[PDB]
């Protein structure tokens, strides 16, 4: 009748988790691949899309740390530091 969506598999193959454990602010993958958007993994990376300019990757520990790391300010989305776009 209804076909279910498949779960998420860590890029390192260490675990299979439902997609509700992706960006859920808890580290489930040894490679940090389930938390690309949060500060939850000690070895993760956050991608600064920097629309129009050179993209950069930063440490996951710099996501919502209150410091402006990406020139587009997208690393600070729920911290109480409002970052301005400084890509130019």
């Amino acid at each position: 009748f209804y076909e279910e969506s498949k779960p998420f598999t860590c890029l390192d193959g260490t675990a299979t988790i439902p997609f509700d454990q992706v960006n859920d602010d808890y580290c489930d993958c040894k490679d940090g691949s389930d938390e690309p958007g949060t500060a939850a993994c000690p070895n993760g990376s956050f991608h600064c899309t920097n629309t129009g300019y050179k993209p950069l990757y930063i440490l996951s520990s710099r996501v919502n740390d209150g410091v402006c790391d990406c020139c587009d300010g997208t690393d600070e989305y729920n911290s109480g530091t409002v970052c301005e776009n400084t890509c130019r």
């Binding site: 520990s61 710099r62 740390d65 410091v67």
Partner: peptide, 15 residues
């Protein structure tokens, strides 16, 4: 605080 950041102010609201 297992999420080590660059300074304590960065960490003081963490789980």
């Amino acid at each position: 605080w297992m999420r080590v950041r660059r300074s304590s102010d960065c960490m003081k609201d963490d789980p």
